[PDB]
Symmetry: D2
Subunit: 312 residues, 4 copies
């Protein structure tokens, strides 16, 4: 019949360990996710969604009593939590990534990164300018044909599916590991005119393998969360690289790149800018961009060997 | 057109003040949502009593907030292993009214929470505390909507389950029962076994001495439904003692005490006839207690009748 | 895993048989029921009469849009509603959109009751087409919005129960050719009105509490919402009473959209439904909102009430 | 508050005109809602999904009393409906297109094409071998971040979103028209080595425009329903063309190409094999393949101008 020992995201977080603030934080975040999932599922019947999602995530995070500094893709400055509701965590989030293409029922998502406040001073925007290497937890919610929450922590990557009947995230995939080498490459080839020669050579090798091996398949949803999730589940490589026109790439470091890089690394994958690990970049602005190449370690290493040969 | 500042049961509990009570009530809400879903699909999918009991026990142990668990479905108290233990003692009725589930009658989960008072290892004895010691108590009613009624020192608040997002939303703040109602509730089928005070009291409701209008009668046969109606519309609910059942039928720990606590926190009353239900010092985890509860003026009217048939 | 041959209310109605208008009608009605169920389940979060009005509007709009109806009688409307010629069909529908709604705030089960007739007359549709005895019913039943949502449907072939599956928004067949127990052990009425009871009611109730034959006294149940009390009577057996007295010589319940549909379900389940003088289904109405006394349920219990009733005048 | 005049798929079909088409589309919607639910819970529950979806669609269609011949992607031969349940329509369907990549939560879908039986003999597989031009109705259900049913008929294309709260398809987009020219191209560029020169040249013009205009963006989900739906909603072009290795393309004519081509044409778009309209191909086998280039009329015409210059 029905399962009596329901393995929820809450139970999982509680089992991992201090004070209990991380559980409070992730529980509040799950409330926001469920509400966003519901609004997305009814979108047609009901920039509106970006604003609503941002408000939901901000309100739920402030009310958790677990956070002090909140950085969102939708706000120019960091939001400082009032002392009454404050906690010890710094949260960087992307409330509804992929929303520009919502009308085609493409998967959209909420991306998040959690840091423990490291400084000995009052909370400020500066507390969010930490390299992704300092992440305590990071992940995303994918609003697709099912709602999934992927959570990475020091112990690894775990996937939780939203059960619509009981409104709970259930553990479905334990200690997820990416394949060593995949057979799919993912990037917007529409920008080929602006590509760096290393990118052009790398793609050419995927379509025309020198070694008689089978050409890779191509997939590009245009929604970061969907493209990263497919990379995690099936293996392969995802690229949003730098070029002469965009020397720092297009994607945002704090709430797009770093969380995805952390999930990748905790799954046994890689995430590079080409020059260094995405997680090693020390940000100087909360909205700064970063180039990103991530996925299966053998595929990223192959890209890096091509990248090196087009370097001084 | 959607609310951005969602007022959940979790937010409410957190605002009232380690954080163990919040963890406890959050785990309980998970069990409630799962029970609600199973009840809503019962025919498409007795066994529900067992499932509900297992769900509530597993969720409570996993909260890290409990040390002693007493259920209507278990002979002895369950002691939580040291790894998962916390400071609270929980008495619960996982699926009250389940014998009549097939008629789509409202069923419910009743619960009572105590902070461990003793200075020793947790035991069954920690559950033998008068209802007066309750930290929190309430019920989930699985009816036309799913409602969670929560009573604490600050009062009674009602939360409705939002099916779209699986969260309990605050719908009724600091709930107060009417001073006097116009409905009486008991199984009149047992009239042959009634104590004369009960017979006289019911006769006064049907044939008022003062020319006032006779009260209406309602009896669902599901304690949570009958108590909830009493709270919302006022009046009186009776499951009293008689010659055959000198201690009543309902169970003190996980039926009477939680309902009595909700009643008192709503400005109502809950008596055995001799004393407040909350004042009975239990000696067995499955002991019975007579119960008369509701609108204070209605219960006082019953007590005046009860006194004249005493001494 | 999952069931591949889903037995829906729609499939069931289609299998029973002409033109296909009855299926269209019951499909439209199910849409209204699902929307009412949802609104009831969220009542406190949303609402903050409202639900009576909404339910009535939903049922009216869905029925008109089915292309299966010509005359609609509702508890909520003074006169019958005549369907515009464009959307006209051959059925007459009497309904109670949200019976028990006065007590909605206590999460008591509420319900939608319905009765369907074929227009018998050779003239233009009018209110008069709804003034037909229950014996003429083609289909009748109710939706119960309780701990689960159930649709009970009676037709010439019998009574079938369908439960709403919330995951797929469809009514699934759960109970085939439902029959009430010959004799039950529960009686149901508002005993608060004892002062106004006719002696036959008083004596009957006394026999239930104080059995002459040493048998066990019956249990009492009274929800105060007709659909809940009738449904419990169907499922567990027993008797339900809303009888006539000196003050209300015609009873309290409404014949067209409360009594007749419930009486039809009862008779099709092997039970009984009487006014005391005749079968509820045999009353020829003269007004769309006329009242009728009703005693229904297990055939042995209703017969036992009638034996007491016969001894009086 | 709540909308009282609910505009459902059923109401819409009934308004367009025995009533067999309504019965057929209503049964199909039941199957779609059940597939949507199973997809939404896929991981919590468990090729299995392909089989389940196929069984659901077959059973619901047979039970509608509206069909006589059923062709599915999952069955080698056509299914002939038993005399008792027989109706006048022929249905070609793809029960769970894109299912090979289900685990990445990519949008999947059900594609369908409906024909009226034209022959005056006993029903057979041959009744399904009709050109897409003969379609009475066609469309798809997209199981994505929301569930949508896109329905094309002689009158045009209409989109219905599944309302999870009431389990009904609600009209959200009336008489849908594709943009004359889009700014997105969609194909698996991983197969570039096998491309015919006209495809290679066409793609090169999209990345390197001769006229100083902005290069097009690229999108390729790898699920036909998702890629076609994005093309309808935002405009542009979708290509699954013929090459030396696959002279007839990869996609199946009866239950993938023809339904998508009919939706495209009814939206003011185009759908070509390169030599003719997909809808004009006279099938000879139920599982035959067809090359397909579809979308915004100006974009498809621009591909055809390149195609014309080659052999
Ligand atoms: Cl591997
Ligand atoms: Cl029997
Ligand atoms: Zn973003
Ligand atoms: Zn109980
Ligand atoms: Zn009524
Ligand atoms: Zn007499
Ligand atoms: Zn396919
Ligand atoms: Zn050429």
């Amino acid at each position: 019949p029905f399962d009596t020992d329901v393995n929820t995201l809450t139970r999982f977080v509680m089992e991992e360990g201090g004070t209990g603030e991380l559980t409070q934080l992730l529980n509040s975040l799950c409330t926001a996710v469920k509400a966003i999932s519901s609004a997305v599922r009814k979108a047609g019947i009901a920039k509106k969604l970006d604003v609503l999602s941002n408000d939901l995530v901000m309100n739920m995070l402030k009310s958790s009593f677990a956070t002090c500094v909140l950085v969102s893709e939708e706000d120019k400055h960091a939001i400082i939590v009032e002392p009454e509701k404050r906690g010890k965590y710094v949260v960087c989030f992307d409330p509804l990534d992929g929303s520009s293409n919502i009308d085609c029922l493409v998967s959209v998502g909420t991306i998040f990164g959690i840091y423990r406040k490291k400084s000995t001073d009052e909370p400020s925007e500066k507390d969010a300018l930490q390299p992704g290497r300092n992440l305590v937890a990071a992940g995303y919610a994918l609003y697709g044909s099912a709602t999934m929450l992927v959570l990475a922590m020091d112990c690894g990557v775990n996937c939780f599916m939203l059960d619509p009947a009981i409104g709970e995230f259930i553990l479905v995939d334990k200690d997820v590991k990416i394949k060593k080498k995949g057979k799919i490459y993912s990037l917007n080839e529409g920008y080929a005119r602006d590509f760096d020669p290393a990118v052009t050579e790398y793609i050419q090798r995927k379509k025309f393998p020198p070694d008689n091996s089978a050409p890779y398949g191509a997939r590009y949803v245009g929604s970061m969360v969907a493209d990263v999730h497919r990379t995690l589940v099936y293996g392969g490589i995802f690229l949003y690289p730098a070029n002469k026109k965009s020397p720092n790439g297009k994607l945002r470091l704090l709430y797009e790149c770093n969380p995805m890089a952390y999930v990748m690394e905790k799954a046994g994958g890689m995430a590079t800018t080409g020059k260094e690990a995405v997680l090693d970049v020390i940000p100087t602005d909360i909205h700064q961009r970063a180039p990103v190449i991530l996925g299966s370690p053998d595929d990223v290493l192959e890209f890096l060997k091509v990248y090196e040969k087009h370097s001084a």
